[PDB]
């Protein structure tokens, strides 16, 4: 009710109309100029607190007539009860661990409370937690238990921690906050779970994937890395051809995108920075799971109708042909607020009620009738068909948002959007760290003219080596490149995360090409002078 905007001189005409309805019990008919008296019609309003962005404080002349009820998030003890029921329902699958159903709920609620207390909107706009996060954690634990092997108590705790990492700590920025979450998770496990058998609990040591086997279980790091390498070679050979170096962080991001695309209704936004791999990782993960990629294409300024027909085609393929689409929505693919509204209402229930209206609605209902008859699931009423349609869209359409630096007005607007925020797994991958840059450069400097230059390995203080200790030129060149990249970014520009390394990859490619060409020229010069000397010796 506080959503409508003010006028030039203040006041909202719709809110004043509501005040007229509540106080004077009537209104004036504009074109007939007559007074109408409404009988026994009640007015009920629902609004977010005024401190939320996009909320305008209404006039007290209006709220004076209504009883304001604050329906806040349920307590800190009601959540404990509710999720005790939830964990009992989950642990019906594994009754051997029935005694641990209460400590799990207590630890989940304590985790939620600590995350709310530590990370707040004062740090990032996207630090907003609610019981929805706890429900997502419960459902993720249930999905991993249902499609997993015979769970043991250590496996149960590690799985719960992995789910916690994916629900809560993915949205965190930087490394300080991630370390804070890791120590918080250690503290929660120690405080509420007397069992002490967990190894490293960090995000890089909790690798759960259903890729290497038929069960959602923990997988070895080296085996998963090799599997991803040999799958990504095939992906490049078959699909698009851009050579990409395999590094540890990309494996974790692949696992995250996989678990999101395997959800019943799972959408993700990859809010990082350009030239990181956000789109290509989504394409690769969808290729692994056999999802059809749809990337909307627009001209300089496409009307909303083009986006509407793109959405309609994607929805039809998802529902009537079970294509299991993976729609990738880039920031450039959004240029007006109508697109954002269409996305948020698509994510709202499951779909667009608007794209099907009139004759197209009749054709859609005929197609739904025939499809439901084909599956032998005949439904004789329109509501059942539309429910089946909504369910198919929910379980077949996955929307992935690719967002560059969120400092842009459109990026901040779409991140702050309520529907997209609540219905998406926010995954902050950000910019490459020192280790990822080191690995990428190391696998890119693998060229033989890197040799032949006598390298005077220096003492090189370990606090400024970043990569592994230096014993060969490769270490020197990678350290020089990464140090120059950091110096250039900290000198030319001022800010946090302007853009992920895109100059780094181009620098490495140009370095490799230039070294190869220059050493080819040097080799032919050596051959010429040596053969000339040989002929002179022959003389």
């Amino acid at each position: 009710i506080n959503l409508p905007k003010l006028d030039k001189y203040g006041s909202q005409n719709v809110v004043l109309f509501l005040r007229q309805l509540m106080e004077k019990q009537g209104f004036w008919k504009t074109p007939e100029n007559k007074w109408v008296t409404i009988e026994r019609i009640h007015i009920v309003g629902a609004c977010n607190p005024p401190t939320d962005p996009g909320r305008i404080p209404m006039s007290e002349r209006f709220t004076r007539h209504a009883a304001i009820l604050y329906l806040g998030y349920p307590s800190g003890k009601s959540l404990s009860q509710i999720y005790e029921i939830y964990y009992k329902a989950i642990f019906k699958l594994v009754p051997e661990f029935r005694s641990y159903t209460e400590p799990f709920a207590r630890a989940s609620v304590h985790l939620y409370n600590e995350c709310k207390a530590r990370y707040s909107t004062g740090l990032q706009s996207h630090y907003l937690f609610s019981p929805r996060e706890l429900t997502r954690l419960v459902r993720g634990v249930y999905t991993a238990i249902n499609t997993g092997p015979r769970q043991t108590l250590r496996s149960l705790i590690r799985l719960w921690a992995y789910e916690a990492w994916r629900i809560f700590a993915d949205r965190l920025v930087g490394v300080k906050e991630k370390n804070s979450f890791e120590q918080l998770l250690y503290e929660t496990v120690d405080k509420y779970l007397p069992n002490q058998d967990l190894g490293n609990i960090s995000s890089t040591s909790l690798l759960f994937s259903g890729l290497l086997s038929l069960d959602f279980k923990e997988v070895n790091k080296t085996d998963l890395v090799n599997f991803i390498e040999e799958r990504f070679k095939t992906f490049c050979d078959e699909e698009l051809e851009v050579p990409m170096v395999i590094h540890e962080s990309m494996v974790d991001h692949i696992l995250r995108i996989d678990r999101a695309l395997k959800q019943v209704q799972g959408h993700m936004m990859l809010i990082g920075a350009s030239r990181t791999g956000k789109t290509i990782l989504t394409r690769f993960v969808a290729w692994l799971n056999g999802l059809k990629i749809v990337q909307p294409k627009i001209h300089r300024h496409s009307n909303l109708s083009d986006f509407d027909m793109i959405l309609k085609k994607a929805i039809s393929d998802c529902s009537l042909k079970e294509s299991r689409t993976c729609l990738i929505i880039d920031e450039s693919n959004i240029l007006e607020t109508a697109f954002l509204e269409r996305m948020n209402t698509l994510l709202a229930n499951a779909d667009i009620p608007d794209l099907f209206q009139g004759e197209e609605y009749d054709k859609l209902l005929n197609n739904l009738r025939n499809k439901t008859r084909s599956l032998g699931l005949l439904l004789d009423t329109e509501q059942e068909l539309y429910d089946w349609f909504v369910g198919e869209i929910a379980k077949n359409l996955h929307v992935v948002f690719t967002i560059c630096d969120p400092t842009n007005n459109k990026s901040s607007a779409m991140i702050s959007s309520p529907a997209l925020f609540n219905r998406c797994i926010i995954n902050w991958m950000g910019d490459w760290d020192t280790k990822t840059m080191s690995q990428v450069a190391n696998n890119m400097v693998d060229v033989i003219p890197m040799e032949f230059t006598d390298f005077i390995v220096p003492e090189v203080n370990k606090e400024l080596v970043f990569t592994e200790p230096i014993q060969t030129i490769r270490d020197a060149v990678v350290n020089i490149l990464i140090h120059f990249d950091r110096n250039f970014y900290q000198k030319m520009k001022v800010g946090v995360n302007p853009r992920s390394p895109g100059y780094f990859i181009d620098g490495l490619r140009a370095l490799v090409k230039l070294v190869t060409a220059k050493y080819q020229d040097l080799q032919e010069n050596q051959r010429f002078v040596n053969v000339g000397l040989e002929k002179l010796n022959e003389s």
């Binding site: 005929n366 197609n367 009738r369 025939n370 008859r373 084909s374």
Partner: protein
């Protein structure tokens, strides 16, 4: 039943509805089981039963072929390329060619060609 099968097959393409056709084949399958075993052992029943299986299994491609994007030129292309025969112009432009003529196209065998043709039909 066999007369019913033949009269269903000769039905012109413009007068068949996909939901109506599906319900009609469901009725045919229901009536088929009521036949005695002596009729079962005789070959025409097996042939018409396989025809009913054809019409039940090619439901998706029939629905995709009943979309409004397809035009008489498109059906001319389908019959010339896949059927390797040309229908008379007066009958083709009315979209009244018998469903038997569509069944002559293997549909299952040429489903990819049909799908690409209907994709171009939608894009026009």
């Amino acid at each position: 039943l066999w007369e019913d099968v033949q009269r269903t097959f000769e039905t012109p393409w413009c007068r068949v509805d996909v939901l109506l056709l599906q319900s009609d084949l469901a009725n045919f399958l229901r009536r088929a089981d009521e036949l005695p075993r002596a009729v079962k052992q005789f070959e025409m029943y097996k042939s018409l039963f396989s025809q009913v299986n054809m019409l039940t299994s090619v439901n998706k491609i029939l629905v995709e072929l009943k979309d409004g994007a397809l035009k008489p030129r498109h059906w001319n292309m389908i019959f010339r390329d896949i059927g390797k025969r040309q229908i008379q112009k007066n009958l083709l432009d009315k979209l009244e060619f018998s469903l038997k003529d569509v069944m002559v196209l293997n549909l299952t065998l040429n489903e990819i060609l049909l799908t690409k043709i209907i994709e171009r039909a939608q894009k026009e």
